[PDB]
Coordinates of C-alpha atoms in Angstrom, one line a residue:
Chain Z
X1 CA 5.2 71.6 -1.9
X2 CA 8.7 71.4 -0.1
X3 CA 11.6 73.4 -1.1
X4 CA 13.9 72.8 1.9
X5 CA 14.2 70.3 4.5
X6 CA 15.9 72.7 7.2
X7 CA 12.8 72.2 9.3
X8 CA 12.2 68.4 8.6
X9 CA 15.9 68.0 9.9
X10 CA 15.5 69.4 13.4
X11 CA 13.4 66.6 14.5
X12 CA 16.4 64.4 13.3
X13 CA 19.6 66.3 13.6
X14 CA 21.4 64.6 10.9
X15 CA 21.0 64.7 7.0
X16 CA 22.2 61.3 6.3
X17 CA 19.3 59.9 8.6
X18 CA 16.5 62.1 7.2
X19 CA 17.3 60.5 3.9
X20 CA 16.9 57.2 5.5
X21 CA 13.7 57.5 7.6
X22 CA 11.8 59.3 4.9
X23 CA 13.2 57.0 2.3
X24 CA 11.5 54.1 4.0
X25 CA 8.3 55.7 5.2
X26 CA 7.8 57.1 1.6
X27 CA 7.6 53.4 0.4
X28 CA 4.8 52.4 2.6
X29 CA 2.7 54.9 0.9
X30 CA 3.6 53.4 -2.6
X31 CA 3.8 49.7 -2.3
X32 CA 1.7 48.0 0.1
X33 CA 0.1 51.3 0.4
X34 CA -0.6 52.6 3.9
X35 CA -2.2 55.9 4.2
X36 CA -0.4 59.4 4.4
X37 CA -1.0 60.9 7.9
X38 CA -0.9 64.3 6.6
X39 CA -3.6 65.7 4.3
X40 CA -1.9 65.6 0.8
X41 CA -2.3 68.4 -1.6
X42 CA -1.6 66.7 -4.8
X43 CA 2.1 65.9 -4.2
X44 CA 4.3 62.9 -4.6
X45 CA 5.1 60.3 -2.1
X46 CA 8.5 61.7 -1.3
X47 CA 7.5 65.2 -0.2
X48 CA 4.7 63.7 1.8
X49 CA 7.1 61.8 3.6
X50 CA 9.2 64.8 4.4
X51 CA 6.1 66.5 5.6
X52 CA 5.4 64.2 8.4
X53 CA 9.0 64.3 9.7
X54 CA 8.5 67.9 10.5
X55 CA 5.5 67.4 12.7
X56 CA 7.0 64.6 14.7
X57 CA 4.4 61.9 13.7
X58 CA 7.3 59.9 12.1
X59 CA 10.9 59.1 13.0
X60 CA 13.1 56.2 13.3
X61 CA 11.5 55.1 16.6
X62 CA 7.8 55.6 15.8
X63 CA 8.4 53.8 12.3
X64 CA 9.0 50.4 14.1
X65 CA 6.4 50.4 17.0
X66 CA 3.9 51.6 14.4
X67 CA 4.6 48.3 12.4
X68 CA 6.0 45.7 14.6
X69 CA 2.7 46.2 16.5
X70 CA 1.2 45.2 13.3
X71 CA 3.7 42.3 12.3
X72 CA 2.5 40.3 15.5
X73 CA -1.2 41.6 15.3
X74 CA -1.0 39.7 11.9
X75 CA 0.3 36.7 14.0
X76 CA -2.8 37.4 16.4
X77 CA -4.2 37.1 12.9
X78 CA -2.0 33.9 12.6
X79 CA -3.1 32.1 15.8
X80 CA -6.9 33.4 15.9
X81 CA -7.0 32.4 12.2
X82 CA -5.1 29.3 13.2
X83 CA -8.4 28.3 15.0
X84 CA -9.7 28.0 11.3
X85 CA -7.4 25.0 11.1
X86 CA -8.1 24.1 14.8
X87 CA -12.0 23.8 14.1
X88 CA -11.8 22.8 10.5
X89 CA -10.0 19.4 11.2
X90 CA -12.0 18.1 14.1
Chain G
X1 CA -10.5 -7.5 -13.4
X2 CA -8.5 -4.8 -11.7
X3 CA -7.1 -3.0 -14.9
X4 CA -10.3 -3.9 -16.9
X5 CA -10.9 -0.1 -17.5
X6 CA -8.9 2.7 -18.5
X7 CA -8.6 3.7 -14.7
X8 CA -5.9 3.0 -12.2
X9 CA -5.7 0.7 -9.3
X10 CA -4.0 1.9 -6.1
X11 CA -4.0 -0.5 -3.1
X12 CA -2.9 2.5 -1.0
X13 CA -2.1 2.4 2.8
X14 CA -4.1 4.7 5.2
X15 CA -1.2 5.5 7.6
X16 CA 1.9 4.3 5.5
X17 CA 3.6 7.7 3.9
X18 CA 4.2 5.8 0.7
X19 CA 0.6 6.2 -0.1
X20 CA 0.4 9.7 1.3
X21 CA 3.6 10.7 -0.6
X22 CA 2.1 9.2 -3.8
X23 CA -1.5 10.5 -3.4
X24 CA -0.1 14.2 -3.5
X25 CA 1.5 13.9 -6.8
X26 CA -1.3 11.3 -7.6
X27 CA -3.9 13.9 -7.1
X28 CA -1.9 17.2 -8.0
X29 CA -2.3 16.3 -11.7
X30 CA -6.1 16.1 -11.5
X31 CA -6.7 12.4 -12.4
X32 CA -9.6 10.2 -11.4
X33 CA -8.1 7.6 -9.2
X34 CA -9.5 5.1 -6.8
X35 CA -8.5 5.1 -3.0
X36 CA -8.5 2.1 -0.9
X37 CA -7.2 2.4 2.7
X38 CA -6.1 -1.0 3.4
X39 CA -4.0 -2.7 6.2
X40 CA -0.9 -5.0 5.9
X41 CA -2.4 -7.8 7.9
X42 CA -5.5 -7.9 5.7
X43 CA -5.3 -5.8 2.5
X44 CA -7.8 -6.5 -0.4
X45 CA -7.5 -9.7 -2.5
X46 CA -6.0 -8.1 -5.7
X47 CA -3.3 -6.3 -3.7
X48 CA -1.6 -9.7 -3.0
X49 CA -2.2 -11.8 -6.2
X50 CA -1.1 -9.6 -9.0
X51 CA 1.5 -8.0 -6.5
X52 CA 4.2 -10.6 -6.4
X53 CA 6.2 -8.3 -4.1
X54 CA 3.3 -7.1 -2.0
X55 CA 4.3 -3.4 -1.0
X56 CA 2.3 -0.4 -0.1
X57 CA 1.3 1.4 -2.3
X58 CA 0.6 -0.3 -5.5
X59 CA -0.7 1.3 -8.8
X60 CA -2.0 -0.8 -11.6
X61 CA -3.0 0.7 -15.0
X62 CA -3.9 -1.8 -17.8
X63 CA -0.7 -3.6 -17.9
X64 CA 0.8 -4.3 -14.5
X65 CA 1.0 -3.0 -11.1
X66 CA 3.9 -0.6 -10.4
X67 CA 5.1 -0.9 -6.7
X68 CA 7.4 1.7 -5.3
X69 CA 7.6 5.2 -3.7
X70 CA 9.9 6.3 -6.5
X71 CA 8.8 4.3 -9.5
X72 CA 5.2 5.4 -9.1
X73 CA 5.6 9.1 -8.6
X74 CA 7.9 9.0 -11.4
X75 CA 5.6 7.0 -13.8
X76 CA 2.8 9.6 -13.3
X77 CA 5.1 12.7 -13.6
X78 CA 6.6 11.3 -17.0
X79 CA 3.1 10.3 -18.4
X80 CA 0.8 13.0 -17.1
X81 CA 2.7 16.1 -18.0
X82 CA 0.7 19.2 -17.0
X83 CA 1.1 20.7 -14.7
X84 CA 5.0 19.7 -14.5
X85 CA 6.8 18.6 -11.2
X86 CA 10.3 18.0 -12.3
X87 CA 12.8 20.5 -14.1
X88 CA 14.1 20.4 -17.5
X89 CA 17.8 20.8 -17.3
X90 CA 19.4 17.3 -16.6
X91 CA 22.0 19.1 -14.5
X92 CA 19.5 20.4 -11.9
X93 CA 17.0 17.5 -12.7
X94 CA 18.9 14.5 -11.2
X95 CA 19.9 16.5 -8.2
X96 CA 16.3 16.9 -7.7
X97 CA 16.7 13.1 -7.7
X98 CA 19.5 13.3 -5.1
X99 CA 17.5 15.1 -2.2
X100 CA 14.8 12.5 -2.6
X101 CA 17.6 9.9 -2.0
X102 CA 19.1 12.1 0.9
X103 CA 15.8 12.0 2.6
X104 CA 14.5 8.3 2.0
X105 CA 18.0 7.3 3.4
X106 CA 18.5 10.2 5.8
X107 CA 15.2 11.0 7.4
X108 CA 13.4 7.9 6.9
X109 CA 15.5 5.8 9.4
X110 CA 14.7 8.5 12.1
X111 CA 11.0 7.5 11.6
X112 CA 11.4 3.9 11.8
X113 CA 13.8 4.0 14.6
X114 CA 11.4 6.2 16.4
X115 CA 8.9 3.6 15.7
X116 CA 10.8 0.7 17.1
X117 CA 13.6 2.3 19.1
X118 CA 14.4 2.5 22.8
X119 CA 13.2 5.4 25.1
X120 CA 16.4 7.6 24.6
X121 CA 16.7 6.9 20.8
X122 CA 13.1 8.2 20.5
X123 CA 14.5 11.5 21.7
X124 CA 18.1 10.7 20.6
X125 CA 16.6 10.3 16.9
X126 CA 14.5 13.3 17.9
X127 CA 17.7 15.0 18.8
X128 CA 19.4 14.2 15.6
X129 CA 16.1 15.0 13.9
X130 CA 14.8 18.2 15.5
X131 CA 18.0 20.1 15.7
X132 CA 19.1 19.2 12.1
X133 CA 15.8 20.1 10.6
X134 CA 16.8 23.6 12.3
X135 CA 20.2 23.3 10.6
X136 CA 18.5 23.8 7.4
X137 CA 16.6 27.0 8.4
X138 CA 18.0 29.8 6.1
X139 CA 17.2 27.9 2.7
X140 CA 13.5 29.0 2.7
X141 CA 14.3 32.7 2.9
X142 CA 16.0 32.4 -0.7
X143 CA 13.6 30.1 -2.4
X144 CA 9.9 30.0 -1.7
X145 CA 10.3 26.2 -1.6
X146 CA 13.3 23.6 -1.3
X147 CA 15.5 25.6 -3.6
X148 CA 13.0 25.5 -6.4
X149 CA 10.5 28.1 -7.5
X150 CA 7.9 25.6 -8.8
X151 CA 6.2 23.0 -6.6
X152 CA 8.4 20.0 -7.4
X153 CA 8.5 16.5 -6.0
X154 CA 11.4 17.0 -3.8
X155 CA 9.0 19.2 -1.9
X156 CA 6.5 16.4 -1.8
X157 CA 9.1 14.2 0.0
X158 CA 9.2 16.8 2.9
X159 CA 5.6 17.7 3.6
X160 CA 4.3 14.2 4.3
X161 CA 7.3 13.8 6.5
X162 CA 6.5 17.3 8.0
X163 CA 2.8 16.3 8.5
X164 CA 4.1 13.6 11.1
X165 CA 6.0 16.2 13.0
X166 CA 4.4 15.9 16.5
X167 CA 2.5 12.8 15.6
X168 CA 5.8 11.0 16.7
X169 CA 6.3 13.5 19.2
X170 CA 8.3 16.6 17.9
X171 CA 8.1 20.4 18.3
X172 CA 10.3 23.0 17.2
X173 CA 12.9 25.0 19.4
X174 CA 15.3 27.8 18.7
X175 CA 15.8 31.1 16.9
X176 CA 14.5 31.2 13.3
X177 CA 11.3 29.0 13.5
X178 CA 9.4 31.8 12.0
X179 CA 11.3 31.3 8.7
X180 CA 10.5 27.6 8.5
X181 CA 7.2 27.6 10.6
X182 CA 5.8 30.3 8.6
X183 CA 7.0 28.3 5.7
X184 CA 4.8 25.6 6.7
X185 CA 1.8 28.1 6.2
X186 CA 2.9 28.2 2.6
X187 CA 2.6 24.3 1.8
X188 CA 0.5 22.5 4.4
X189 CA -2.8 24.0 3.0
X190 CA -2.6 23.4 -0.9
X191 CA -5.1 21.8 -3.0
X192 CA -2.5 19.2 -3.8
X193 CA -2.3 18.6 0.1
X194 CA -5.9 19.6 1.4
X195 CA -8.0 17.4 -0.9
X196 CA -5.2 14.8 -0.7
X197 CA -4.7 14.5 3.0
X198 CA -6.2 11.4 4.8
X199 CA -8.4 12.3 7.5
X200 CA -6.8 9.6 9.7
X201 CA -3.5 11.4 9.5
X202 CA -5.2 14.6 10.3
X203 CA -6.6 14.2 13.8
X204 CA -2.7 14.5 15.1
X205 CA -2.9 18.2 14.0
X206 CA -4.9 19.4 17.0
Chain S
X1 CA 1.1 24.7 -26.9
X2 CA 3.9 25.1 -24.6
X3 CA 2.0 27.5 -22.5
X4 CA 3.5 27.6 -19.1
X5 CA 4.9 24.2 -19.3
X6 CA 7.9 22.3 -21.1
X7 CA 7.8 20.9 -24.6
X8 CA 4.5 21.1 -26.4
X9 CA 2.7 17.9 -27.4
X10 CA 0.9 15.8 -30.1
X11 CA -2.8 15.7 -30.6
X12 CA -3.4 12.0 -29.7
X13 CA -0.3 12.5 -27.5
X14 CA -2.7 14.2 -25.2
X15 CA -5.5 11.5 -25.7
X16 CA -3.5 9.1 -23.4
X17 CA -3.7 12.1 -21.0
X18 CA -7.4 12.7 -20.9
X19 CA -8.4 9.1 -21.0
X20 CA -10.7 9.6 -23.9
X21 CA -8.6 8.7 -27.2
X22 CA -10.5 9.9 -30.1
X23 CA -10.7 12.9 -32.7
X24 CA -12.6 14.9 -30.1
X25 CA -9.3 16.2 -28.8
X26 CA -9.0 17.8 -32.3
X27 CA -12.4 19.4 -31.4
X28 CA -12.1 20.6 -27.9
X29 CA -9.3 22.7 -28.6
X30 CA -11.0 23.5 -32.1
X31 CA -14.3 25.0 -30.8
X32 CA -12.9 26.4 -27.7
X33 CA -10.3 28.5 -29.3
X34 CA -13.1 29.8 -31.4
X35 CA -14.6 31.2 -28.2
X36 CA -11.3 33.2 -27.5
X37 CA -11.4 34.3 -31.0
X38 CA -14.8 36.1 -30.5
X39 CA -14.6 39.8 -29.3
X40 CA -14.4 41.2 -25.8
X41 CA -12.6 37.9 -24.8
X42 CA -9.8 39.2 -27.3
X43 CA -10.0 43.0 -26.5
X44 CA -6.9 42.7 -24.5
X45 CA -5.2 39.8 -26.5
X46 CA -5.8 41.5 -30.0
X47 CA -3.9 44.6 -28.4
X48 CA -0.7 42.9 -29.1
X49 CA -1.0 42.5 -32.9
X50 CA -0.1 45.5 -35.1
Chain E
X1 CA -27.4 50.6 -21.7
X2 CA -23.7 49.5 -22.7
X3 CA -25.2 46.0 -22.7
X4 CA -27.3 46.5 -25.8
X5 CA -24.7 47.1 -28.7
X6 CA -23.0 43.7 -28.8
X7 CA -22.8 41.0 -31.4
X8 CA -25.7 38.6 -31.3
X9 CA -23.5 35.7 -30.3
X10 CA -21.5 37.8 -27.6
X11 CA -24.2 36.7 -25.1
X12 CA -22.8 33.2 -24.9
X13 CA -26.2 31.9 -25.8
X14 CA -26.5 28.1 -26.4
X15 CA -25.9 27.0 -29.9
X16 CA -29.3 25.4 -31.2
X17 CA -31.3 27.9 -29.2
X18 CA -28.8 30.4 -30.6
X19 CA -29.6 28.9 -34.1
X20 CA -33.4 29.3 -33.6
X21 CA -32.9 33.0 -33.0
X22 CA -30.0 33.8 -35.3
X23 CA -31.0 31.5 -38.3
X24 CA -34.1 33.6 -38.4
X25 CA -32.4 36.8 -39.6
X26 CA -31.9 38.7 -36.4
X27 CA -29.5 41.8 -36.8
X28 CA -28.2 43.2 -33.3
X29 CA -28.8 42.8 -29.6
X30 CA -30.1 46.3 -29.0
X31 CA -33.2 45.3 -30.8
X32 CA -33.3 42.2 -28.5
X33 CA -34.8 44.2 -25.9
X34 CA -37.6 45.2 -28.4
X35 CA -38.1 41.4 -29.4
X36 CA -41.8 40.4 -29.2
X37 CA -42.6 36.6 -28.6
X38 CA -45.2 36.4 -31.2
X39 CA -42.3 36.9 -33.7
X40 CA -40.7 33.7 -32.7
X41 CA -37.1 23.4 -26.3
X42 CA -36.4 26.8 -27.3
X43 CA -38.2 29.2 -24.8
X44 CA -36.1 28.5 -21.5
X45 CA -32.9 29.4 -23.3
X46 CA -33.7 33.0 -24.4
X47 CA -35.1 33.6 -20.9
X48 CA -32.4 32.9 -18.3
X49 CA -29.9 34.6 -20.7
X50 CA -31.6 37.9 -20.7
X51 CA -32.5 37.6 -17.1
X52 CA -28.8 37.0 -16.0
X53 CA -26.9 40.2 -17.4
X54 CA -29.5 42.9 -17.4
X55 CA -31.4 42.1 -20.6
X56 CA -35.3 41.8 -20.8
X57 CA -38.2 41.2 -23.1
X58 CA -40.6 43.5 -25.1
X59 CA -38.9 46.5 -23.9
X60 CA -39.4 50.0 -25.2
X61 CA -36.3 51.5 -27.1
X62 CA -36.4 54.3 -29.9
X63 CA -34.0 55.8 -32.3
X64 CA -31.9 52.7 -32.8
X65 CA -29.5 51.4 -34.7
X66 CA -27.8 54.5 -36.2
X67 CA -24.6 52.6 -36.7
Chain R
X1 CA 37.0 17.2 -15.9
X2 CA 34.4 14.3 -15.8
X3 CA 36.1 12.2 -13.1
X4 CA 34.9 8.9 -11.5
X5 CA 35.6 7.3 -8.2
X6 CA 35.0 3.8 -9.6
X7 CA 35.9 0.5 -7.7
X8 CA 38.4 -1.6 -9.7
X9 CA 36.3 -4.5 -8.8
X10 CA 32.7 -4.0 -7.6
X11 CA 29.8 -4.6 -10.0
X12 CA 28.5 -1.2 -9.3
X13 CA 31.5 0.6 -10.5
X14 CA 31.5 -1.9 -13.5
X15 CA 27.9 -0.9 -14.0
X16 CA 28.6 3.0 -14.6
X17 CA 31.8 2.0 -16.8
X18 CA 29.4 0.4 -19.3
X19 CA 27.2 3.5 -19.6
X20 CA 30.3 6.0 -19.9
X21 CA 32.2 3.7 -22.4
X22 CA 29.0 3.0 -24.4
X23 CA 27.9 6.8 -24.8
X24 CA 31.4 7.9 -25.6
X25 CA 31.9 10.1 -22.6
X26 CA 35.6 11.4 -22.3
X27 CA 36.1 10.5 -18.7
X28 CA 39.1 9.8 -16.3
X29 CA 38.6 7.1 -13.6
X30 CA 40.5 7.4 -10.1
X31 CA 40.5 4.0 -8.6
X32 CA 39.7 3.0 -5.1
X33 CA 42.0 0.8 -2.9
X34 CA 39.9 -2.4 -2.7
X35 CA 36.5 -0.9 -2.5
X36 CA 37.6 2.0 -0.2
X37 CA 39.0 4.8 -2.1
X38 CA 40.8 7.8 0.0
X39 CA 39.4 9.7 2.9
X40 CA 39.8 12.6 0.5
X41 CA 36.5 12.1 -1.0
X42 CA 34.3 12.9 1.9
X43 CA 34.4 16.6 1.3
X44 CA 32.7 15.9 -2.1
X45 CA 30.9 12.8 -0.7
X46 CA 29.7 12.7 2.9
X47 CA 28.6 9.1 2.3
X48 CA 32.1 8.0 0.9
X49 CA 30.4 5.3 -1.2
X50 CA 31.6 4.5 -4.6
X51 CA 30.9 4.9 -7.3
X52 CA 30.6 8.8 -7.3
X53 CA 30.7 11.2 -10.3
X54 CA 32.2 14.7 -10.3
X55 CA 32.0 16.8 -13.4
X56 CA 32.8 20.5 -12.6
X57 CA 29.8 21.1 -10.6
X58 CA 27.9 18.0 -9.6
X59 CA 28.1 15.3 -7.0
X60 CA 26.2 12.2 -7.4
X61 CA 26.2 8.9 -5.3
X62 CA 24.0 6.0 -6.7
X63 CA 23.9 3.7 -9.7
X64 CA 20.5 5.2 -10.3
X65 CA 21.3 8.7 -10.4
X66 CA 24.8 8.5 -11.8
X67 CA 23.7 6.1 -14.7
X68 CA 20.5 7.8 -15.6
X69 CA 21.9 11.2 -15.7
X70 CA 24.5 9.9 -18.3
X71 CA 21.4 8.9 -20.3
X72 CA 19.1 11.9 -19.9
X73 CA 22.0 14.4 -21.0
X74 CA 24.2 12.3 -23.6
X75 CA 21.1 11.4 -25.8
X76 CA 22.4 9.1 -28.3
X77 CA 22.7 6.0 -28.4
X78 CA 19.5 6.0 -26.1
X79 CA 19.3 3.3 -23.4
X80 CA 15.5 3.5 -22.5
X81 CA 12.1 3.4 -24.2
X82 CA 10.5 6.4 -25.9
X83 CA 7.0 6.3 -24.6
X84 CA 6.2 6.4 -20.8
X85 CA 4.5 3.0 -21.0
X86 CA 7.5 1.1 -21.3
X87 CA 9.8 3.0 -19.1
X88 CA 8.0 1.8 -16.0
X89 CA 8.7 -1.7 -17.3
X90 CA 12.4 -1.1 -17.6
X91 CA 12.5 1.3 -14.7
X92 CA 11.0 -1.4 -12.7
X93 CA 12.4 -4.3 -14.1
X94 CA 15.8 -3.1 -12.9
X95 CA 14.4 -2.7 -9.5
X96 CA 13.9 -6.4 -9.4
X97 CA 17.5 -7.4 -10.0
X98 CA 19.0 -4.8 -7.8
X99 CA 16.7 -6.1 -4.9
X100 CA 16.5 -9.9 -5.4
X101 CA 19.6 -10.9 -7.0
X102 CA 22.3 -8.4 -5.9
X103 CA 21.9 -8.4 -2.2
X104 CA 21.4 -12.2 -2.8
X105 CA 25.0 -12.4 -3.8
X106 CA 25.9 -11.0 -0.2
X107 CA 26.0 -14.3 1.5
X108 CA 27.8 -15.9 -1.6
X109 CA 30.6 -13.5 -0.8
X110 CA 29.8 -11.8 2.6
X111 CA 28.2 -14.9 4.0
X112 CA 29.7 -18.0 5.6
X113 CA 30.2 -21.1 3.5
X114 CA 26.9 -22.5 5.0
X115 CA 24.8 -19.8 3.5
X116 CA 26.8 -19.7 0.3
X117 CA 25.0 -22.8 -0.8
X118 CA 21.7 -21.1 0.7
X119 CA 21.9 -18.5 -2.0
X120 CA 23.7 -20.7 -4.6
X121 CA 21.3 -23.2 -6.0
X122 CA 18.0 -21.3 -5.1
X123 CA 19.2 -18.6 -7.4
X124 CA 20.4 -21.0 -10.1
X125 CA 16.9 -22.1 -11.0
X126 CA 16.0 -18.4 -11.5
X127 CA 19.0 -18.1 -13.7
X128 CA 17.2 -20.2 -16.4
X129 CA 13.8 -18.8 -15.6
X130 CA 14.1 -16.2 -18.3
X131 CA 16.5 -18.4 -20.3
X132 CA 14.0 -19.7 -22.7
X133 CA 12.7 -16.2 -23.4
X134 CA 16.0 -15.3 -25.1
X135 CA 14.1 -16.9 -28.2
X136 CA 12.1 -13.7 -28.2
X137 CA 14.5 -11.0 -28.5
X138 CA 18.4 -11.0 -28.9
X139 CA 18.9 -9.1 -25.5
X140 CA 16.9 -9.2 -22.3
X141 CA 13.5 -8.2 -23.6
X142 CA 14.9 -5.9 -26.1
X143 CA 15.9 -6.0 -29.7
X144 CA 18.5 -3.4 -29.1
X145 CA 20.9 -3.4 -25.9
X146 CA 19.6 -0.9 -23.5
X147 CA 19.9 0.2 -19.6
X148 CA 18.1 -2.9 -18.4
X149 CA 20.8 -5.4 -19.4
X150 CA 23.4 -2.9 -18.0
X151 CA 22.8 -4.9 -14.7
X152 CA 23.5 -8.3 -16.2
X153 CA 26.5 -7.9 -18.4
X154 CA 28.5 -6.9 -15.1
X155 CA 26.5 -9.5 -13.3
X156 CA 27.0 -12.5 -15.7
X157 CA 30.8 -11.6 -16.0
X158 CA 31.0 -12.3 -12.2
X159 CA 29.9 -15.9 -12.6
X160 CA 33.2 -18.2 -12.3
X161 CA 34.5 -16.3 -9.6
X162 CA 31.2 -16.6 -7.6
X163 CA 30.8 -20.1 -8.4
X164 CA 27.6 -21.0 -10.0
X165 CA 27.6 -21.8 -13.7
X166 CA 25.7 -23.6 -16.6
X167 CA 25.4 -27.3 -16.7
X168 CA 23.0 -29.1 -19.3
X169 CA 20.0 -26.8 -19.2
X170 CA 20.3 -23.2 -18.5
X171 CA 22.8 -22.8 -21.1
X172 CA 21.0 -23.7 -24.3
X173 CA 19.1 -20.4 -24.9
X174 CA 21.3 -18.5 -22.3
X175 CA 24.9 -18.7 -23.4
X176 CA 23.9 -17.2 -26.6
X177 CA 23.4 -13.9 -24.6
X178 CA 27.0 -13.5 -23.1
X179 CA 28.5 -14.5 -26.6
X180 CA 26.7 -11.5 -27.9
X181 CA 27.0 -8.9 -25.3
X182 CA 30.5 -9.6 -24.2
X183 CA 31.9 -8.7 -27.7
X184 CA 30.5 -5.2 -27.9
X185 CA 33.3 -2.6 -27.7
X186 CA 31.5 -0.9 -24.8
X187 CA 31.8 -4.1 -22.7
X188 CA 35.1 -4.8 -24.6
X189 CA 36.9 -1.5 -23.7
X190 CA 35.2 -1.5 -20.2
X191 CA 36.9 -4.6 -18.8
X192 CA 39.7 -3.9 -16.3
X193 CA 42.8 -6.0 -15.3
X194 CA 41.3 -6.6 -11.9
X195 CA 37.7 -7.6 -13.1
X196 CA 39.1 -9.8 -15.8
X197 CA 40.4 -12.6 -13.9
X198 CA 37.0 -13.6 -13.1
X199 CA 36.8 -15.5 -16.3
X200 CA 38.8 -16.4 -19.3
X201 CA 37.3 -13.9 -21.8

């Protein structure tokens, strides 16, 4: 579905970073599978990762706040579930 | 009498960690044992007559009582095999008998000294204790336990002495507690621990 | 058997483990492993033999 | 159903109450839905076993068994 | 490469030597000054407490670990029971003597001449306690010498230097012991020039 990354490299003006961002976002859709933001058309996970980068909804900045927001909301799932040992012991 | 059955006889202690260290391995093998939370001033009768050394705990199985924190939790790991608790290679086995000796002689005195020590030692010990337990931080990243995949006895020497963390006035401080504090989420709520914990020792969890 | 553990064990060697020493230990394994022998509890286990 | 074409012991039924049924020369389970009670503590043990997996008594089932 | 930081005198270092020279381990000892080896072992031993074993990967500091490792790894001849019932007997019988008797001998050497008597005779009556039982087996509760008597052979040998001895009773069924274990090549070729002048053997 993707023959060239000439357009998905203008959001990131560097080839050696496009192969790092999309190499990491293209793992979340394979292990610990999150959801591809774009509607897939029977493609792999790689080319789906290179199709978000062109439309700005992924980059090296969004790809952390999208997650570190989750890394602590699971710690919001830590304390709020920590009440489960708070009310289970008394 | 006491050993008249094929059953055990454990004159355990309700607060003394020797009981709570033993009962973990004691119940982690799925064996029908008898709990008797008893005191030093007044334990049960059998705990003083057949126990010519009078320690806590004390396990008795059809031949004689076995009194120690080590001789007991060793006698069970060598007689009730499955699941296993100690490795096979004698190289990495006796070293697993070394951390247990570098804890009963290293982090035990920091508990008794905080039980009978002066006002500064209680934090001085808490000084040498709290930071030192942070000096062992990066260990847990590599291995899911104390340098061993399987749940082994060297871990059981920690958690009963990690369950009395704030009960004697301790709380963590510094960068990297998420590696050890998150680790406590992996050990403090196991069947070997959950069903084994004494409710008396629980109320200092809130 | 040595499944998921160290060295295997003898029959009444285990009798001191389940507290009931008798020739039942040659039975509990006996009839139970017949249960795994029946089909659809071995449809995935049988698949390894050629 | 797919829950008809099994070996007669493949319902994990209990041995004596399994012996009462099976010792009386029963062949397959797909006919067990057609089992009539006039043809047979042995009653409790055929009852909660069929009413646990999706089986039942005196049913209506034609063209069976063709191997 | 199997080194040993033994003391030339102390019964602990004499403990491990009986295990090494029994099993047949090709070892090499590096003596300590009196019971103080150099400051050059704190790197491989933060305790600096002899004895200490070093074999190419390992560091171990106790009579428990250092003496049982050599049993669980050099199998024959074996110095322990076979079935788990009796190990707790041996594994705990040696907890008695290492707690009652050994620290009892502190005041006999590290305690003033007053308490030397306080430890001397109260212990002697124990010394003939198991004495009649030697008409049960040859060794200390065993027909074949094992790890349990490993705490007595280096203990009995320290009698005449310590001071307490046998006189009348306590030597009838007892002295047959030391005339039976003190001749084995293990305890023969373990004796050192310093630990030898504590008796005439």
